[PDB]
Design a protein around this ligand. Structure first.
Ligand SMILES: OC[C@H]1O[C@@H](O[C@H]2[C@H](O)[C@@H](O)[C@H](O)O[C@@H]2CO)[C@H](O)[C@@H](O)[C@H]1O
Ligand SMILES: OC[C@H]1O[C@@H](O[C@H]2[C@H](O)[C@@H](O)[C@H](O)O[C@@H]2CO)[C@H](O)[C@@H](O)[C@H]1O
Lengths: 144, 286, 286
């Protein structure tokens, strides 16, 4: 039963810089790659009522969740408090993804670096967030 | 420990005409003013390996550049030695510019909004908006500065080239002529200055050492002549008074002959003694 | 831009015995080798304000430090002038160390994983694991190096202090004596070297000019004597051959008196001519 603005289930994750690149793991990093039509570009989003946040696992690796390491990278890891994400919906299915926890006593969010709007081969990072206007922190969640 | 206690100006690599400007707790970006409003003392803490950036404001003397966490805003606040008042000065070698990172959170660095004319914190990128030119305040004020130069024994008279073809240098009453104005330019390699007379394109003030103590204007197309370069040293507790010594022999100071004040009095070099006839006011032409 | 084309070693501020080391495309952190495996040429691209970091590997001459984006892995790959092969060299002033940031993503900087003995990436922080010492390879190799010094006219002989009380310096046959070994120390302030004789605690090689061309060992507690400092410059296309010139007058090179070779031949300073009796092999005592 729905408890929030974003229903449970399987999503593709994209950056606003590109309609054709999809979030998937590559080695231990996360990056946006060409459509593979495979499970590793499918993400299971599940709401947690107790913390009013979301945990997001990879469909190909169902016991691995989006998390973050001690080096600023988004990672895929076993369940922990670093796997809790607090989205801010800013358009139809565009979200800023904050870590539930304050990091270095700031809001931190998913962040993808672009060079003239190109994000190829960039790893997804966790960087400070200050407002809802940072393009490098905007991500589409498409039910699919 | 080489920038410690140095007084500097800080301007933007993105717009070199904009300087960090402080008044009443607010930091903005503003055109060059050549005064304390744009001056900052760098204060090194060896344990943190980071710097406080303290305003040389004359009314509030304890103000330092401060990150207003958790926002991205910057201001100046009373120095409490807090982590959000410390900054890492990272020199981008080959670019002669600095990235200035928060010591509290080095993910974040100063970013110049040249359109709002203020500063904020930002994550890094490859633009010039996060790069800053940090310069000794004397160099910053004097470099490319068009001035008149007066002995402090008579502030109504100035050092001049006689005219476009008479390259001699003497003392004369100020009459607003271009032969009475000099553009100071700093040479980074030589770490010294030249004085270009504005009546000529390439004529600089020069110690003619093959003729005793004489100084004259000569062409700056004499490439490696140290006699054409000068050190400009501020006199303590004044805003515009300097001694001026020659790069070829730094014991040699720009000197008003005998300390006479008459029109036509010779300007020369002479052994430095720091008397009043070897002190000069470098000023905006009115 | 003072670093362009310079050949350097890079070591870790977190572990100063560990250096960047390259073989067959793999980069790791390894003890000092004093050879081309730990040498890198910095190649400045002025438009990017960034550097390629190229291995001096004599076998594969085209390999540069490369971030294997998007992974955490650093390796050396064929130079294709790509963004993941460019690096911002940010000097942390006061700290005398460098942060090495990726040009492809300047939020990410090299991180020394000293336990795995390799390199990865991190966002900026205040830890010593992202700080590096980048040094001209000659200085890196010679600083704190204990050596024997042989003329190239006879490698079996060496420059020695005569004995612990006789502070004179001459040529003699190698016998592993402490009076025959020298510990080189680089003084970054003076940009020159000192040679410490290991039979003394504070005795250095000095040109006592008050006795003409006489070089001897004397106390290093004589502070301001440039005669106690030397420039060591590599002879072209060699592995361990140098010339040694005095700081006070730089055309005063270390000279094997007359080019003689017998035991007891004097060691002196003599005007430079670059001939065989002013060249020296500086070696590990075997
Ligand atoms: O080369 C001139 C020299 O003059 C000195 O002042 C002299 C002055 O020439 C003389 O007329 C006066 O009676 O005694 C003075 C000596 O103290 C300046 O001191 C010197 O700076 C030069 O200007
Ligand atoms: O005294 C040092 C000086 O000696 C030269 O060798 C000379 C030698 O002194 C002289 O007796 C002889 O007649 O000719 C030699 C040169 O061919 C060195 O060549 C010179 O470098 C100095 O070291």
């Amino acid at each position: 039963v729905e408890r929030t603005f974003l229903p449970n289930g399987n999503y593709n994750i994209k950056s606003i810089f590109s309609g054709s690149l999809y979030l998937n793991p590559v080695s231990k990093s996360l990056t946006f790659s060409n459509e593979s039509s495979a499970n590793n570009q499918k993400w299971n989003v599940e709401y947690m009522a107790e913390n009013r946040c979301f945990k997001i696992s990879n469909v190909a690796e169902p016991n691995k969740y989006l998390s973050y390491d001690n080096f600023g990278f988004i990672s895929l890891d076993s369940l922990s408090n670093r796997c809790y994400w607090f989205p801010i919906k800013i358009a139809v299915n565009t979200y800023i993804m904050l870590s539930l926890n304050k990091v270095n006593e700031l809001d931190y969010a998913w962040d993808i670096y672009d060079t003239n709007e190109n994000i190829l081969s960039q790893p997804l990072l966790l960087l400070p967030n200050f407002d809802i206007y940072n393009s490098n922190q905007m991500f589409k969640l498409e039910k699919i | 420990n080489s920038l410690n206690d140095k007084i500097v100006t800080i301007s933007c690599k993105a717009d070199t005409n904009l300087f960090f400007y402080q008044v009443a707790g607010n930091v903005s970006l503003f055109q060059q003013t050549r005064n304390y409003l744009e001056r900052w003392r760098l204060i090194y803490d060896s344990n943190k390996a980071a710097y406080k950036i303290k305003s040389m404001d004359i009314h509030n003397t304890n103000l330092v550049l401060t990150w207003n966490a958790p926002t991205h805003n910057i201001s100046t606040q009373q120095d409490s030695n807090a982590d959000n008042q410390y900054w890492l000065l990272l020199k981008d070698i080959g670019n002669n510019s600095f990235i200035i990172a928060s010591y509290k959170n080095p993910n974040l660095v100063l970013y110049a909004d040249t359109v709002a004319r203020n500063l904020k914190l930002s994550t890094l990128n490859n633009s010039n908006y996060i790069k800053f030119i940090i310069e000794d305040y004397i160099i910053s004020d004097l470099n490319n500065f068009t001035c008149k130069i007066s002995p402090i024994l008579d502030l109504n008279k100035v050092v001049q080239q006689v005219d476009v073809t008479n390259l001699n240098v003497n003392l004369y009453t100020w009459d607003y002529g271009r032969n009475q104005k000099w553009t100071i330019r700093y040479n980074e390699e030589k770490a010294a200055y030249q004085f270009f007379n504005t009546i000529l394109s390439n004529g600089v003030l020069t110690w003619i050492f093959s003729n005793g103590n004489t100084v004259r204007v000569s062409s700056s197309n004499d490439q490696n002549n140290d006699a054409q370069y000068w050190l400009i040293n501020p006199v303590s507790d004044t805003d515009e008074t300097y001694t001026i010594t020659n790069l070829r022999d730094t014991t040699k100071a720009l000197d008003l002959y005998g300390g006479q004040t008459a029109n036509g009095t010779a300007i020369q070099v002479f052994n430095y003694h720091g008397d009043d006839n070897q002190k000069w006011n470098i000023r905006n032409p009115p």
